[PDB]
Amino acid sequence: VDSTASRYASALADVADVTGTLEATNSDVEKLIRIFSEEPVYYFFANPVISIDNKRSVLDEIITTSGLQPHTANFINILIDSERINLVKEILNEFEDVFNKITGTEVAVVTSVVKLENDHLAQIAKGVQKITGAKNVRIKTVIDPSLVAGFTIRYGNEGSKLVDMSVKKQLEEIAAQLE
Amino acid sequence: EISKIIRERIEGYNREVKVVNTGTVLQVGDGIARIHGLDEVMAGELVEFEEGTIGIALNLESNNVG
């Protein structure tokens, strides 16, 4: 994808990569996402009517308490100057996808009816680094009851590639008995 | 984490701008203004400006009002 939100996030990652603050910058970017969730905080930055000069002063105070990285504080200042603060949320989310690309890591999603153990997670991570080529592999879990018993993982560059065996047995048997 | 000073500061800026029946002019050109705010204005409502001009609200977009 190449949209304005994606374009900005990619720049932010590239500067971190140059300066070797990829771990350090990523923590700050995660820290920002908590900040901009709040409807009141996001609204103040986003709306055109509030004066830009006031926005910087408030932003500086926010940066100090936060203790953000020197570029990360710039990056928000750049967004504010160039009017694209209305799409901060898209930009922040976009950065995570870019950050995985730079490391060479991959992300996976595995879902189950009941919570499961760590060795299963490590072996799914093994299989996903096999079929994907993660330099390293990463994993996430979301407990959903409306399946039968299985696990579904979800991976790829987007949340695209899906394999599972819980209810796909049953829906598959409906669609195979119509044959 | 946003501190107690910065929380009450941003709401201080926010409380003032977000008035209930009021708005803020964003653009004026050749007979049409774009208005930030007017969150409870209705389609077709007469809309009075600060110099004293009267307008009619037609486009109630999600960001501004034509």
Question: What φ, ψ does residue A86 adopt, rounded to 5°?
Answer: -70, -20
B48-55 long-range contacts (CB < 8 A, ≥24 apart) are B49/B25
Strands B46-48 and B54-56, bridge-based pairing: antiparallel
Rounded to a whole number of angstroms, the distance from the CA of B44 to the nearest CA of chain A is 23
Of the candidates B34, B40, B10, which has an alpha carbon nearest to the alpha carbon of residue B22?
B40
**Dihedral (Cα; B21, B22, B26, B29), 10-degree rounding:** 90
At A12, which amino acid appears? L
Chain A residues touching residue B37 (CB < 8 angstroms): 49
CA–CA dist A161, A1 (Å, integer): 17
Which of B1, B2, B27 best probes binding to A when mutated, by most A CB atoms within 10 angstroms?
B2
Resolution attained, angstroms: 3.2
Q: What is the CATH number of domain B1-66?
A: 2.40.30.20
Q: Cβ(A65)–Cβ(B3) under 8 Å?
A: yes
CA–CA dist A96, A162 (Å, integer): 20
**Chain-centre distance of CA A62, in angstroms?**
23
| Domain parsing of chain A, residue ranges | 1-104, 105-179
| Domain parsing of chain B, residue ranges | 1-66
What is residue A171's three-state secondary structure?
helix
Given the structure tokens 């977000």, which residue do they identify?
B18
